[PDB]
């Protein structure tokens, strides 16, 4: 099934974005005075709460590239969760047509 | 109907996650200097604003396990709300095919 295939592809891609985003955020934020997103472990946590939209506000990017990385994490997170929902819709719709006799 | 069954199963599971997550967060956060998520009543409120994504930022986990618990709460919340939406889609789609004559 395509909907379950694209969903799985979205989840694995999300994990890649989370890891890479955690790596790129630190690389981008270091060098800017006052930045807190400068260590990998908490950067990964930041990526999670960002991708899930959430955004406690305990950690936030202050640089241009750190914020661009953030946007990518947001979109990847929203798209994946939106794709899972879309996949769940197809499963339920296809199932309802079966118990109806259509 | 499956879509209404999985939705109800998601809502009751969400409540379980909220309660357990409120319990596990306190257990994980206590022992870490500076942690505020250390009492059950406000921990439950934290779980609610976390599961609904949202995240005011008044309460936030600082430990590894407290943050892992948070992620579970997030996913459970997002999945449930995404499953409700998917169930609402199936209801409307199945209804539109009826008033159309298909």
């Amino acid at each position: 099934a395509l909907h379950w295939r694209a969903a799985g592809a979205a989840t694995v891609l999300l994990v890649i974005v989370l890891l890479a985003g955690s790596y790129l955020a630190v690389l981008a934020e270091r060098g800017a005075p006052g930045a807190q997103l400068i260590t990998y472990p908490r950067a990964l946590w930041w990526a999670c709460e960002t991708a899930t939209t959430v955004x406690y506000g305990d950690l936030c990017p202050v640089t241009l590239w750190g914020r661009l990385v953030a946007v990518v994490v947001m979109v990847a997170g929203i798209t994946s969760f939106g794709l899972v929902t879309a996949a769940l819709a197809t499963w339920f719709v296809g199932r309802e047509q079966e118990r109806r006799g259509h | 109907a499956l879509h209404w069954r999985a939705a109800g199963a998601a809502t009751v599971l969400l409540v379980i996650v909220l309660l357990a997550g409120s319990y596990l967060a306190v257990l994980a956060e206590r022992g870490a200097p500076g942690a505020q998520l250390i009492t059950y009543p406000r921990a439950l409120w934290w779980a609610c604003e976390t599961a609904t994504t949202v995240x005011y930022g008044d309460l936030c986990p600082v430990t590894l396990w407290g943050r892992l618990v948070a992620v579970v709460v997030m996913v459970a919340g997002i999945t449930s709300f995404g499953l409700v939406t998917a169930a609402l889609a199936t209801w409307f789609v199945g209804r539109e095919q009826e008033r159309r004559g298909h």
Partner: antibody
Amino acid sequence: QVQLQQPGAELVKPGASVKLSCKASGYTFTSDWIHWVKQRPGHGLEWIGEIIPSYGRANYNEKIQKKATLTADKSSSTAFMQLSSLTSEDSAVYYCARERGDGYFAVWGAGTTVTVSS
Amino acid sequence: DILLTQSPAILSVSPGERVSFSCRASQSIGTDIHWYQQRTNGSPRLLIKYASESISGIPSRFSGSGSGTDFTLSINSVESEDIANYYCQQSNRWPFTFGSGTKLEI
């Protein structure tokens, strides 16, 4: 084994330049940052700058004079600090340290005693 | 940038007595503070990471505490080998900064 190997000493004439080395061993991750710390005789530790060998990007302490230039060689796992236009102020022991990207300096080098004199 | 204040600069104490080093940050840095030990003509050595976490190889004599602004490095019953300079370092905000340091005398 010694994780960070630095030269014992470096003698530099006033105005000249010097390229300090920091050969690294042990476990090496892409998340590793190499830092440099300056310590003048009778003074405390002073952060100079940092560099990530896996990407090559470097940051410097902008609170002090820009005397250093950080480069790295991923082939030999050795970090370098280019000090130029040295005066008597730059005469100090320069340590290099490894950070696993988690904030603390796990291991330090023996330090290179740089003396600026004619 | 974050200023780390270590007072007093020199700390005198009798043998076999508990001692405490102070480190105060100009801003709230949670528990992102790290302690180092530097003996005469030696390189700095990590004693405590993240305010209170122990390090492999370091005697159980050393301990750490504190959060936010005030931090403390403690030594239960000091020994002669503890004679050194003690520095604190924060990793909460860029750039990383060191304290002025505290000298221990017996």
